[PDB]
Design a protein around this ligand. Structure first.
Ligand SMILES: [Mg+2]
Ligand code: NA
Lengths: 272, 267
């Protein structure tokens, strides 16, 4: 029976993106007097699967799942990510390709011509990274440039320490860049440290930006250019769609996909 | 699975998101799920959370000295009845933090985040430790070095630090009441070409992840997040099983703290 509880299963709250998304979900849910059970999956496929079927989450009327480990699939469900589940499930994602194209256009518009993509593999990519890469590549082609594999730098985990490590390593290997588009703010700020510790001027020598707008970038030094991917809209769409699914669980709603509008937020790290 | 509630100011605050992550992890170990609510740190919202869950873990910011359901409070001991409190070592940690700055040879130590004349709660305890450290070093408190802020956030730290710097106040160190304040202060110092730690040594309190990757990296205090979370969840589990006998007398837990030395105070 209806409890008025929805679940939110995310990798971990220690990740700013998920903590901020959770804050927005809780706030929106409270407007229709739902409460939120927050589960952590560690981004592990086995834990994501458990969230869908284990009686541990029986108090919930439905689930919002942000999967990372899943890609053989299995409680009303809305997924926060790219299309994944078949059947009567909705997916709410971000405009990865369009935002990556606009970010890259911004850097090229500053007169930078050797733009590094920090957080994607140069030859074999999958999912989100593949969409970001497609936007980046579109922008470079439009500016008469070919991709340079030395400028496409994979990173195992999109975190601060990994971005610092990778940035330091490519700088020390002698790779020449004039701008860096990092796949999230955490990567960007790790990169920022490695740049500053090597005396590289930001943005004088290397313009830098992130993605997500979750690092309180107004207060970094330099302040960090980023992309707001529509967290408020993501939360509202997710909660609204899930409520609809909870009301139609006994039955008929066609699967939907949506991706809210992004906004570039220009700060000091790219010339603001 | 049993069900507990966790009420914090907001998950957008790094310290609370990190603490929430630990609480949820400990609860999962103990076959508990967690309903998370936000209060904005406002008294009325905190009290309303008290008025689904088998027990509640409340982290208030807005309550000061001036239900039939189990309750554990992360904060100063203010509730009567069979309520357990887990309280960080504010005074001792502030004394140790101030001693750390004084040990570098600094003699004009600013306290960023407390009122100069009327303080309550946490700020009063922090001030006491700061004041004792200065007294032991033969120093007196200068009210111009005790700087109040809007709220303990990055914007407020940046705004207050910018105001005192542009005013010409002379300091050689800053002890900020939390890492968010310290990170905001760092920007205001850097944008003015003030060397950290060379001109001004800086530290915070909370050990948020972001402080490892600033340049300089931020010296801080880790107030005991693992013990806070474990103590809280474990005590709540005890009260839930008791179903209000109040046979367990109220407890006061005080987790151990640790100074984390980074580049902003010299390593
Ligand atoms: Mg119960
Ligand atoms: Na003094």
């Amino acid at each position: 029976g209806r409890s008025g509880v929805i679940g939110l299963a995310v990798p971990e709250l220690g990740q700013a993106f998920f903590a901020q998304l959770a804050d927005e979900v809780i706030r929106v849910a409270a407007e229709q007097d739902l409460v939120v059970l927050v589960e952590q999956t560690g981004g592990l496929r086995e834990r994501e699967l458990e969230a869908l079927r284990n009686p541990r989450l029986s108090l919930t009327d439905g689930l919002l799942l942000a999967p990372l480990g899943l890609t053989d699939d299995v409680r009303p469900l809305v997924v926060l990510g790219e299309p994944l589940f078949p059947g009567p499930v909705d997916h709410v994602t971000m405009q990865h390709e369009a935002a990556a194209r606009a970010a890259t256009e911004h850097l090229l518009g500053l007169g930078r011509r050797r733009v590094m993509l920090l957080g994607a593999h140069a030859t074999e990519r999958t999912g989100v990274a593949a969409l970001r890469y497609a936007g980046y590549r579109e922008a470079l082609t439009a500016a008469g440039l070919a991709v340079d594999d030395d400028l496409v730098v994979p990173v195992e985990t999109w975190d601060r320490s990994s971005g610092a490590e990778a940035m330091a390593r490519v700088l020390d290997a002698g790779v020449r860049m004039d701008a860096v588009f990092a796949m999230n703010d955490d990567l960007a700020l790790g990169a920022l440290r490695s740049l500053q510790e090597r005396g590289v001027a930001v943005p004088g020598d290397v313009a830098l930006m992130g993605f997500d707008d979750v690092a309180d970038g107004r207060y970094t030094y330099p302040s960090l250019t980023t992309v707001e991917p529509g967290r408020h809209d993501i939360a509202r769409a997710a909660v609204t769609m899930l409520s609809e699914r909870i009301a139609d669980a006994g039955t008929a709603i066609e699967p939907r996909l949506t991706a809210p509008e992004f906004r570039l937020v220009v700060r000091e790290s790219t010339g603001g």
